[PDB]
Amino acid sequence: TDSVYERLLSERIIFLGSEVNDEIANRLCAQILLLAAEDASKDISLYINSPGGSISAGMAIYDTMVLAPCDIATYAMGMAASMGEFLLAAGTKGKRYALPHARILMHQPLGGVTGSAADIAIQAEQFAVIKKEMFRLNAEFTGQPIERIEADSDRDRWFTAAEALEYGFVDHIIT
């Protein structure tokens, strides 16, 4: 089982196949660092079957994709939701794919507050910063106006592969 993921890593294919945590994000950023060192002009394919996960873990993966010399193809296999939708849509323009029966979900961040009323206010201050920046980035990726992103993302919004192409999450549907 990890013998397949290594045989595929030699062919420049990597998976984001679970929930996005520091651990999957770090094994993944390391895999992109290695793969750009072996060859910095061949693309990397990142297949995504993910329900979401930490925004902080996803910015490591997201920043690492972008600084890569080479292109990152993203493929939506089955489902890429929330932070998975973010990383699919962050793939290099023109090289974001959706399989035909994949599903894309977009929604706003979730979290918790705890502590004193002064600590919670700080927590909320970051809630707003984080919310505005993630919609801006979704806005850049999809071509939609920021106003529609904030609006559609108020509660879970599902897209089929076909509607995901209209919205701007992907560039092609593989056949």
Partner: protein, 196 residues
């Protein structure tokens, strides 16, 4: 673990226990954590004592670690609405919501035993509450309104400017009975009335 005793007059023999007797003399005891049950129990008590005689005083003994906030303001609004005056006494401790309740006593009638301590700090949330940011954005707004309300009603009864309260309640502030008098939370520190 609590005796009952028996009193007598030309009229009849009465069996009561120590808190009933205390209720008989218009003393309410607030000595558990202020939760929602506790709070109803104390309004019910305030209102009945106001019904039985609105021109005779109500006394609230306070040895309490505080409690919820909507439960705080309920007891507080009742304290202030009832026609009878309210004398508050801090035995041992009055912290958090209970320290505001001590201060909201009718003026001149706030006291504390000598080794009582009064703690004041800003509302905290010991659990975690979870949701969409839109939901937590709303709770955080109410949690801040809760803090400034605790600070302006504290300011109203202590005479401090509310901006001082907010700086003092940023971190916990412990006060000895006397420090509480200077701060403005109580008016008098009981002298021991013992001949020995």
């Amino acid at each position: 673990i609590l005796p009952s005793f028996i009193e007598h007059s030309s009229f009849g023999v009465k069996e009561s226990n120590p808190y009933n007797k205390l209720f008989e003399e218009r003393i309410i005891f607030l000595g558990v954590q202020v939760d929602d049950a506790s709070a109803n129990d104390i309004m019910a008590q305030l209102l009945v004592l106001e019904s039985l005689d609105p021109d005779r005083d109500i006394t609230m003994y306070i040895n309490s670690p505080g409690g919820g906030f909507t439960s705080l303001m309920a007891i507080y609004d009742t304290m202030q609405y009832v026609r009878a005056d309210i004398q508050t006494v801090c035995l041992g401790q009055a912290a958090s919501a209970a320290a505001v309740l001590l201060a909201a006593g009718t003026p001149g009638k706030r006291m504390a035993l000598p080794n009582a301590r009064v703690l004041i700090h800003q509302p905290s949330l010991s659990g975690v509450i979870q949701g969409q940011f839109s939901d937590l954005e709303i709770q955080a707004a109410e949690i801040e309104r809760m803090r400034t309300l605790m600070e302006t009603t504290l300011a109203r009864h202590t005479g401090k400017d509310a901006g001082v309260i907010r700086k003092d309640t940023d971190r916990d502030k412990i006060l000895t009975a006397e420090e509480a008098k200077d701060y403005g939370i109580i008016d008098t520190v009981l002298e021991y009335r013992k001949l020995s």
